[PDB]
Amino acid sequence: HHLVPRGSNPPPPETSNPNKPKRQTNQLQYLLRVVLKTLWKHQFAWPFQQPVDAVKLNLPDYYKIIKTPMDMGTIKKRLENNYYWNAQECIQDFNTMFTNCYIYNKPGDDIVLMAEALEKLFLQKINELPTE
Ligand SMILES: CCN1C(=O)c2cccc3c(S(=O)(=O)NCC4(C(=O)O)CCCC4)ccc1c23
């Protein structure tokens, strides 16, 4: 951990906003109960379920390169804690998650194929959102 750089990890992203008024909506409810749940169980979801551990995954420069980390565990907590004001904010966090993967990794990488498959499913599921 000295001679060869091993990296280090930030605290995970914030998942609650104590100042924010509770505002439940049908789209946010659908995002939690259907979209995220469907994405979570996909065969390729596991790498995206928790924050990247730059040290344990041997990605020592991950957090040099990725300034706005995001993962599905964080998105799940944000939906649970009514952190998002609207569906768009939630969608933006999914976009950040996928694009982080594309930014860090090379286009031909296995993890990129996985992210692309999840992203395609996500975009399909987004078409299902209720009419608020
Ligand atoms: C989605 C967060 N994420 C990365 O961007 C990333 C890059 C490289 C490896 C890796 C991993 S890993 O568990 O070390 N390897 C995952 C796999 C790979 O070939 O990268 C191994 C089998 C499936 C994908 C988990 C989450 C990651 C990455």
Q: Ligand 1, atom 26: nearest CA belongs to which residue?
A: 47
The secondary structure element, H or E, covering residue 93 is: helix 87-104
Resolution, Å (one decimal):
1.6
DSSP string, 2-48: -SS-----PPPPP---TTSPP---HHHHHIIIIIIHHHHTSTT-GGG
Q: Ligand 1, atom 20: nearest CA belongs to which residue?
A: 111
Q: How far apart are CA 127 and CA 94, in angstroms?
A: 15
The domains of the chain are located at 25-129
Ligand 1 pocket test: which of 57, 62, 114 has the largest number of ligand atoms within 8 Å of its C-beta? 57
Q: How far apart are CA 41 and CA 79, in angstroms?
A: 17
Ligand 1 midpoint to CA 25 (Å): 34
Q: What's the CATH superfamily of 25-129?
A: Bromodomain-like (1.20.920.10)
What residues contact residue 111 under an 8 Å CB cut-off, 6+ apart? 47, 101, 105
Ligand 1 midpoint to CA 101 (Å): 9
Closest to 8 measured CA to CA, from 64, 80, 87, 90: 64
Technique used by the depositors? X-ray
Q: How far apart are CA 45 and CA 49, in angstroms?
A: 6
DSSP state for residue 61 in the 8-state scheme = T
Q: How far apart are CA 120 and CA 11, in angstroms?
A: 29
Q: How far apart are CA 68 and CA 74, in angstroms?
A: 12
